[PDB]
Amino acid sequence: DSFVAHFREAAPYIRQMRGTTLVAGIDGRLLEGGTLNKLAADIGLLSQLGIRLVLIHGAYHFLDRLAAAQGRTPHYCRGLRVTDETSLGQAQQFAGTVRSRFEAALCGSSVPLVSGNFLTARPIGVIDGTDMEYAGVIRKTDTAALRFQLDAGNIVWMPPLGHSYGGKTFNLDMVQAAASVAVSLQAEKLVYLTLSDGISRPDGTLAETLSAQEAQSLAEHAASETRRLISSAVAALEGGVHRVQILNGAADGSLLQELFTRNGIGTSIAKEAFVSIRQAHSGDIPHIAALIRPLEEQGILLHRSREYLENHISEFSILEHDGNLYGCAALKTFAEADCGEIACLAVSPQAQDGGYGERLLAHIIDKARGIGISRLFALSTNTGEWFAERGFQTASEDELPETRRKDYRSNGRNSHILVRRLHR
Amino acid sequence: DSFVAHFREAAPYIRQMRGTTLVAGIDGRLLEGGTLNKLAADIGLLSQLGIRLVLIHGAYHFLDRLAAAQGRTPHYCRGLRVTDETSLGQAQQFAGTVRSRFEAALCGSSVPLVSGNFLTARPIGVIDGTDMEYAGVIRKTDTAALRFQLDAGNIVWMPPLGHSYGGKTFNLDMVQAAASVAVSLQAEKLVYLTLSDGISRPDGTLAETLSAQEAQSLAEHAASETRRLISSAVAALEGGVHRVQILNGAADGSLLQELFTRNGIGTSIAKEAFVSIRQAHSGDIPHIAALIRPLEEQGILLHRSREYLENHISEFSILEHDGNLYGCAALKTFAEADCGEIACLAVSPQAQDGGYGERLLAHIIDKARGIGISRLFALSTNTGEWFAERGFQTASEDELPETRRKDYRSNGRNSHILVRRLHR
Amino acid sequence: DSFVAHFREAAPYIRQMRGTTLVAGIDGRLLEGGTLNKLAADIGLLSQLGIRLVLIHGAYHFLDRLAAAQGRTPHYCRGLRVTDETSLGQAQQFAGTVRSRFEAALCGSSVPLVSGNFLTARPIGVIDGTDMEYAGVIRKTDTAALRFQLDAGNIVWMPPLGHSYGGKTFNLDMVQAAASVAVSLQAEKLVYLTLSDGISRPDGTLAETLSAQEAQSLAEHAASETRRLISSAVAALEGGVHRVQILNGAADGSLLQELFTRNGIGTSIAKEAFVSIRQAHSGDIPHIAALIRPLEEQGILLHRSREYLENHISEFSILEHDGNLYGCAALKTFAEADCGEIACLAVSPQAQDGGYGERLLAHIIDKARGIGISRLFALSTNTGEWFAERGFQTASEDELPETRRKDYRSNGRNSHILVRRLHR
Amino acid sequence: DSFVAHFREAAPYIRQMRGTTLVAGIDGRLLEGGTLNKLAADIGLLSQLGIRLVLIHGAYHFLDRLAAAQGRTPHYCRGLRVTDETSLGQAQQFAGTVRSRFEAALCGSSVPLVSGNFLTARPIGVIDGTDMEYAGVIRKTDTAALRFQLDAGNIVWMPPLGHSYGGKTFNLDMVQAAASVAVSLQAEKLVYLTLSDGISRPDGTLAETLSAQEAQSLAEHAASETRRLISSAVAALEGGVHRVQILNGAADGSLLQELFTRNGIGTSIAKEAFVSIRQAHSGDIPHIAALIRPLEEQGILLHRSREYLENHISEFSILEHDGNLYGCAALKTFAEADCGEIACLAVSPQAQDGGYGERLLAHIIDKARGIGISRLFALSTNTGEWFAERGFQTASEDELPETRRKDYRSNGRNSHILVRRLHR
Numbered sequence A, B, C, D: 001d002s003f004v005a006h007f008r009e010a011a012p013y014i015r016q017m018r019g020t021t022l023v024a025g026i027d028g029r030l031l032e033g034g035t036l037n038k039l040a041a042d043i044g045l046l047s048q049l050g051i052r053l054v055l056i057h058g059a060y061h062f063l064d065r066l067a068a069a070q071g072r073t074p075h076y077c078r079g080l081r082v083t084d085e086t087s088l089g090q091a092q093q094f095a096g097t098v099r100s101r102f103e104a105a106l107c108g109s110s111v112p113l114v115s116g117n118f119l120t121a122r123p124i125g126v127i128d129g130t131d132m133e134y135a136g137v138i139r140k141t142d143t144a145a146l147r148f149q150l151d152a153g154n155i156v157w158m159p160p161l162g163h164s165y166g167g168k169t170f171n172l173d174m175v176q177a178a179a180s181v182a183v184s185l186q187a188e189k190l191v192y193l194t195l196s197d198g199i200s201r202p203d204g205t206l207a208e209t210l211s212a213q214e215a216q217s218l219a220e221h222a223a224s225e226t227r228r229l230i231s232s233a234v235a236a237l238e239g240g241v242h243r244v245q246i247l248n249g250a251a252d253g254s255l256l257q258e259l260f261t262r263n264g265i266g267t268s269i270a271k272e273a274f275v276s277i278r279q280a281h282s283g284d285i286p287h288i289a290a291l292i293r294p295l296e297e298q299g300i301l302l303h304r305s306r307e308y309l310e311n312h313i314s315e316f317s318i319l320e321h322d323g324n325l326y327g328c329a330a331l332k333t334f335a336e337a338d339c340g341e342i343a344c345l346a347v348s349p350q351a352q353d354g355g356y357g358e359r360l361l362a363h364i365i366d367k368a369r370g371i372g373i374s375r376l377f378a379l380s381t382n383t384g385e386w387f388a389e390r391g392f393q394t395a396s397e398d399e400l401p402e403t404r405r406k407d408y409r410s411n412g413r414n415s416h417i418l419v420r421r422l423h424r
């Protein structure tokens, strides 16, 4: 396509990304090739787009390439690496070489790039009888110092090294340091730049998009690296990060196609907040009734009756939490097999504006869809735009299921009629 | 091309545009069609890219469409419009309709849009025996209030109306109000969104790019509208604005192809700052000598002699200002017709870092080019990167004109050799 | 009176008003006459006095004056107006004419006047079988943007128009948009500038001052306009606004006599926070005792006994909330019919400094007054200034009821004696 | 001595140092021993005292210790080092090792330590036929970014590496990078932490304190390292830095004894601003007269006469600049060989408050001292505290030289008499 079409397409993701914080965990193999200049460039552009950037790199592969050419051999414990005085010192050397190169790359094709003692570490200790030695884990992150640099527009660069109040240095594991930092910052996005195109399903298909549950249930039969990825990405979400992404940092332009297209190129994982939605049974009716009543009084919801609810309780769903009731929604069906209607959508006012509404709408569409309904109607006197913004188009009475067209004519409410199509 | 290629291409213009101020003078016919939704959209995106926006619209065409359907007829004096109480009142109505529509357009496909009493006007008075009445000209612009809103990230919307301390309103001419506002703000860019694709040359070719001089000399045989455009665009430059652009605000996506491509779609006008560059004659030598001397002393410039300068004065150019001498540069030629060399490039240290250097380099390339030289060498001990950043590639001794290869070998300076190709 | 006396009288209301936020809902008939220049002037002065101003106007009457001269006729549903595409467009025109005129008025006899997309609207929908069409209600107010402009000292101007994320405009009802905005801002004062001198009582007397209850109970027999006024003013209070005022915006200088005199010219409505105050019965004594005890221990409250409380429980009042007890206060009476004494005033320390103290004092004066007491004494060892600041003057022992003069002499406490007069 | 005496002595240097900027150029041998923990500690304390710190280290000695153990050998050109791709890469490694260790040292016995791309470099080029290769010199310092970090209280750490807009890295020479940075910042103090105790005189005595002139004239017979030190320290002063210090960064606590004692431990160099002070001859009298006159008129300066000036012109000194006259001061002598008096001290009012006054006082004391005067009197009606703050004690008439005691008695001015002692 044309430039204007590309830019206009990017446009809504530029709006989303702006003034947002992105933690990038970068595999340290990317900090070497022509993959570096490409990456530095793309990172400069993300700066220019008003994305707050915290970049973390790893050092493990560099550490093995040395451990294999020096005679010595690497030891790993749950995926963490035993690091001694020696590998520690080399990891300090690498940090410096890679910071200086990333800066020349960035500067060379000025963007403000900053680096600081933000992390205090502490040794992992001993895992499973094995002393990890100088392997560390972040103990404290100066979250205020970091925000401070990010407020000023600076890009933050972190090596995988932290210090302790004993004057020692420890080698952090990047995959879990990035997820720790993202959580502290409450970064909207954690991005893992790997050498592989996302996370594959059981039959070799790339998982475009996963819940934290589906990510979880993939790891059971996944390689160990991708299980550590998944584990960190899940804890990041759990700790508040809104979205983690896995990309191939080696594939040219990937970061940009990730962030700024509907499509993308790796894997994106998000967590579902909890919402018990179930079939109403008849113990809910007083609960439903008291929710629904003042809305009927207000002219918002169709005059009902309790005996209706009792004989139609099977078409209701309720949303709850700690056994209290925060939402309801009904599915009506018609002589026409292809039609349904969502009716009686209602969220407790104190619990409004958190997405309960939506969650109930979604659940009614899944219900509709499982019985072969492809057209969902909503008739609303006072609430149509809510459905208009959520996929519903305007319709006519002459468009209703025939008996609904009747009720509508005789109810006198003159509500606005709207439909959504639902796909197989 | 691909998305990534488009975005990577935009990238350096996103860097230029960012935190920069753009005044847009918008023809009020654009505020009506599907040209409005397209424009509002593109303007929202420029916001999202961190461009400070001041938008001004005109009302003249709306005013005539009324003046032609109401019976009355428009009168114009130098291109300014006589506006009475009545047309004044309609122009107030239009402002409101067009502000409200631009806001619905913008909001509807939230970006912060602000509008204020920034302008105090005063009547133009009487031109050429003709009373302009309620035609106004900006008398004072609250430049601090404006910056203030722009600092906060707000987009500024202005109607073509200002008030006076007598409690009257006047109808501003948009083309010149925008240029006045841009000048007050010292906006880096003034953009005129018109219904025509830029400014045409004598044979119907679009003028991609003009100096303020070339714009000027076009207007002699130009239509009156485009002469008023040109006149305002010239005064804007003169008053400090760095770049004015003329586009077709009706052609879909034009603003975006303007700002964010090497190419573009309308006309871009810029002003040449003054620089007397001429052939040295022999009254300059003491001037050149005293400039050049301490650089030779420092090992920066080739050991010279005065008798050299006297017998080679014809290959020197000097840069001056108020009769003082701020730069010099030489062109050497060789047995090879295709070769030249820039030597003895030198700017007075007090006058450095304003582009004098560059201006002398440019002038030497134009000189070289007019005698059929296509390869310009520079040999520099201490200054090569200056030429490297300005189009010069690295070369070998074996690449020099043969006699230059000799001198080089026997001078012992071991300088870095660099060439630039020059096109016909 | 003299200038100095007027200014010195204004003075304490200038102190109250300063740095405070006032939302003004302005009837759009005022935006036309010589009532405009007068109003603009007075509003400029309120600016100069450091009052944060948000001004909203209505458009309904303008809309009818058109709907009556164009042939068409207005329809109203609960007092809201059905507005179509056409009246919508005229309402956009009016906004522009009236904003521009208010600005010329203000500027013309410079004060910073700002206007923005602060309001997102949504259609009211269908009321009572009737489609309101383009009638809107505020869905979201950019409360941060507003504060931001108000922080900088800007006066905010709002038309009665909001947009939706569908790119549509809707006509807001001013009386309820102003009350919505005031609530969002938590404005200390909402002011309705009407064409009538406040709100009349059942016999044509102007209600100077009303509780939200008394406003409420007036509306039962009130005209429909004044019932909508009252309804919005009540919800504004309920939602947190401290004071709503109704004035005649057409009566010259009214706003200034409202704000800055003890008197005023329209109607001022305020809401009573809740305080269950009742007669103690004997189930309170352990509650009273435990409150009062540590104060006796501290020398603050007269040594008592439980058998006293039991035989005098009828002279106590208690203040409660959720059945817990937060205050007590006693009324003593004397051989002298004209005398009372407030004794044993005590507020739970955790519940102090919210006006409970005062509420109990007030309730004791109402009690005293209903039995024909015109002189209330308070004898306080440690707390006299509290009574001194609340209407109590210093007195002598020789001033006490005779038997109180006795007890006082023999109790030895040497407390400070103070009286307040109470009127019929 | 006691703690309290030490702290009270430090006290006035803590006041001087506070909110002041200190650039420390650190020899990279200090970044290794137990000299590191000692230094990190002392630097943490300077932070805690509110000193803004920019720290720069060198890498040359590390580079030779490698160049001597790897086979290769170092080349130096004017003291700058030829650095190739290889040594460049090692210098990147060293930076990282030394930054990480300095941070563990500092953290380990949390103070905010920051590091950034503040420096853009460019190759030195070719010196004296010799290509320096990857040897760099700072081209641009982001002085705003630096101040920004320093404003926030952060300590700035710089390696001796900068980048260019070509994406290359270059090895800066620390001694001259520190002096460049200090000048950009206008740091009050540049401190060189070396392995030697300051700068020695011709006979092995440590130069406690030097003018930039005396530093200069030492370098003629100084070792080459100390000549480069001296040269950078002089240009730093010349460029605006107020004080440069040379210490032994290896001698325990030296930095603290430098900054915070009257004494110190290395060498401190400062520059004398220019002041032509000379003997008045008789071409000055109209100049002196016009200066002195309005002060006599004001009662500030003793009534004089021109014929006095003409016959006493030899006891006057004048201060000038571009041949204009900005100060005068006289030395009187007496029958008592041990006494002098400064009289007629006067600075042009436009040129006041820049230290001219002082410079003239100093010059008169040097004059006095060279003729064997050990007691300088000043008699001032209106100006005594100026002399009181500058070493003069209060005295009596009975203390004056006998004939001065006479004049004083008969002049009637009743001025305040003050003396200063002057040492051999």
Ligand SMILES: CC(=O)SCCNC(=O)CCNC(=O)[C@@H](O)C(C)(C)COP(=O)(O)OP(=O)(O)OC[C@H]1O[C@@H](n2cnc3c(N)ncnc32)[C@H](O)[C@@H]1OP(=O)(O)O
Pocket (backbone or CB within 6 Å): A295, A300, A301, A342, A343, A344, A345, A346, A347, A348, A351, A352, A353, A354, A355, A356, A357, A358, A359, A378, A379, A380, A381, A382, A383, A384, A385, A386, C122, C139
């Ligand atoms: C066919 C039918 O069922 S018609 C009956 C529909 N039910 C009602 O009208 C009952 C009263 N209103 C409610 O209960 C509203 O909560 C609901 C049901 C419409 C939405 O429930 P919520 O839990 O608030 O849903 P959710 O959080 O996903 O949506 C919230 C958003 O809906 C928007 N919304 C809510 N009311 C309306 C409305 N009447 N018009 C337009 N938008 C609205 C809210 O402003 C909020 O906006 P935002 O995303 O910019 O914050």
Ligand SMILES: CC(=O)SCCNC(=O)CCNC(=O)[C@@H](O)C(C)(C)COP(=O)(O)OP(=O)(O)OC[C@H]1O[C@@H](n2cnc3c(N)ncnc32)[C@H](O)[C@@H]1OP(=O)(O)O
Pocket (backbone or CB within 6 Å): B295, B300, B301, B342, B343, B344, B345, B346, B347, B348, B351, B352, B353, B354, B355, B356, B357, B358, B359, B378, B379, B380, B381, B382, B383, B384, B385, B386, D122, D139
């Ligand atoms: C072939 C030959 O003629 S070799 C002899 C070249 N002459 C010299 O070296 C003389 C001493 N230096 C000068 O006179 C420098 O001014 C010149 C001639 C190189 C440039 O002149 P200016 O008027 O400063 O030119 P202009 O303003 O267009 O260029 C300024 C930019 O050049 C950069 N520049 C200047 N010196 C150098 C250098 N030695 N190395 C790299 N960049 C440099 C400046 O830092 C400035 O950077 P910026 O754009 O990021 O601010």
Ligand SMILES: CC(=O)SCCNC(=O)CCNC(=O)[C@@H](O)C(C)(C)COP(=O)(O)OP(=O)(O)OC[C@H]1O[C@@H](n2cnc3c(N)ncnc32)[C@H](O)[C@@H]1OP(=O)(O)O
Pocket (backbone or CB within 6 Å): C295, C300, C301, C342, C343, C344, C345, C346, C347, C348, C351, C352, C353, C354, C355, C356, C357, C358, C359, C378, C379, C380, C381, C382, C383, C384, C385, C386
């Ligand atoms: C005659 C008699 O009853 S004497 C016995 C009076 N009772 C006591 O002294 C009991 C201990 N103190 C209390 O219980 C105090 O709460 C009371 C009863 C005096 C006031 O009750 P509150 O609920 O705090 O009353 P309210 O909120 O209306 O008054 C609060 C104000 O009273 C002021 N106030 C409270 N104590 C005193 C005092 N001893 N002296 C002066 N002012 C005081 C508070 O500082 C507060 O000041 P503000 O308006 O500048 O914030």
Ligand SMILES: CC(=O)SCCNC(=O)CCNC(=O)[C@@H](O)C(C)(C)COP(=O)(O)OP(=O)(O)OC[C@H]1O[C@@H](n2cnc3c(N)ncnc32)[C@H](O)[C@@H]1OP(=O)(O)O
Pocket (backbone or CB within 6 Å): D295, D300, D301, D342, D343, D344, D345, D346, D347, D348, D351, D352, D353, D354, D355, D356, D357, D358, D359, D378, D379, D380, D381, D382, D383, D384, D385, D386
């Ligand atoms: C013995 C005799 O010669 S008596 C005659 C002395 N001459 C006068 O009184 C002439 C009028 N005043 C002057 O000419 C003043 O400039 C002088 C001569 C006293 C000082 O000259 P300057 O160039 O200002 O000297 P310098 O800059 O070193 O001293 C400036 C400081 O002196 C202080 N100072 C100046 N006047 C006085 C005074 N009358 N009393 C106390 N302090 C003073 C200034 O406030 C300034 O204060 P700072 O250091 O806190 O800024």
